[PDB]
């Protein structure tokens, strides 16, 4: 209940969260190979970038995916991106999974339990979906915030119809373990700091997984 407020956000943080979760393109590729992982020639025909630089945190996390068949799903940014070919490189935090023995026979549609001021509301089953056994929290989070902004105007200002002032996204697993992200706890105001919550390549099993969402207009 002690969540961060929308009114306490920095100068351009709200507008940049809207870009990341609603407008900006996502780096989505299957079966590709490459503290960082450089995907040279990732973009084809793009006017800004050629390469994709993926940050995994440390060398130990990189060795797990370095030189092996890999799946990508994450938010990329160009501003303040360090590394690769200068001015022609896009950056990404995590969103890495091993390709082999990870594909699902039938697409799993992650159910959403949405609460607005304590009152439970319905979300269509097709909003958050994946074809992966072990999914990065980024993949599910990117889809869930896209729906929230499209339906409730999550990252729009109060003047623009954004009623939600407080929010919590809980990725509840079958055992009882939870991955919790405060919808308004923004690290800085730009995607280089904002997307750092995905630095730790947090992977969770899609089997018997549901998303618990708690929104507050107050």
């Amino acid at each position, epitope marked *: 209940k002690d969540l961060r407020k929308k009114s306490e956000l920095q100068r*351009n943080a709200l507008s*940049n969260l809207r*870009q990341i979760y609603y*407008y900006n393109e996502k780096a989505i590729t299957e079966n590709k190979e490459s503290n960082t992982l450089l995907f040279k020639g990732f973009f084809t025909g793009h*006017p*800004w970038y050629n390469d994709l630089l993926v940050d995994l945190g440390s060398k130990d996390a990189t060795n797990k995916y370095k030189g092996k068949k890999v799946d990508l799903y994450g938010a990329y940014y*160009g501003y303040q991106c360090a590394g690769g070919t200068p001015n022609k490189t896009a950056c990404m935090y995590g969103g890495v999974t091993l390709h082999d023995n990870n594909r699902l026979t039938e697409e799993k549609k992650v159910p959403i339990n949405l609460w607005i001021d304590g009152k439970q509301t319905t979300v269509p089953i097709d909003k958050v979906k994946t074809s992966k056994k072990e999914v990065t929290v980024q993949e599910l989070d990117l889809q869930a915030r896209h729906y929230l902004h499209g339906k409730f105007g999550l990252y729009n200002s109060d*003047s623009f119809g954004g009623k939600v002032q407080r929010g919590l996204i809980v990725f509840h697993s079958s055992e009882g373990s939870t991955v919790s992200y405060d919808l308004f706890d923004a690290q800085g105001q730009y*995607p280089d700091t904002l997307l750092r919550i995905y630095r730790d390549n947090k992977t969770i099993n899609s089997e018997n997984l549901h998303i618990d969402l708690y929104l507050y207009t107050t």
Partner: T-cell receptor
Amino acid sequence: TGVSQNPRHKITKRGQNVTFRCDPISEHNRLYWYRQTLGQGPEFLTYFQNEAQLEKSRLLSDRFSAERPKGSFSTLEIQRTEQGDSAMYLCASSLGGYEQYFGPGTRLTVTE
Amino acid sequence: IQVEQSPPDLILQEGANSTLRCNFSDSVNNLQWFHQNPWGQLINLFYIPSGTKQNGRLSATTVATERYSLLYISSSQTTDSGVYFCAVDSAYKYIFGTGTRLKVLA
């Protein structure tokens, strides 16, 4: 120049909403928005570098919202329009920022 | 920061030379000269944070130490009539001057 702006002219009632589009030069990573009142020079509103919004002035109030809806353009929305909003809305792009290349602009008139 | 253009209005005869001044308050990394036609289109003349540049009939000189830039128009034609602007980088956030309205007579 290679920078396009739509519409060229727009007339709206006081209190209504208005949206302007800016199509920059594809190779340019930076996008700028300016407001130009009759007689005066262009005043800085906001600016983007790649996907990120970098700066926002005091003139770009809560009634104003700028975004890059992916990926070859940008929009500028003004809610609950005042007669004081009646100005030339210019859009510029640059591959630095070094040399800013300006569009033709959107001429807005807010009538009672 | 602040940027002032001198003179505010200029009445010139055809074929005669003219000089437009631009004064800025702080150090500048990027300086640009523009020309605005009656339609409102801003035409790029020079990108000159320092030194000397020449583009045919037009030339520009920026003295970065004394915080000023000058725009020279040799053999002023009726086509050159309009509003000339000087814009400065606040170090990014660009600030345009008051402007100079050129009235080239026939």
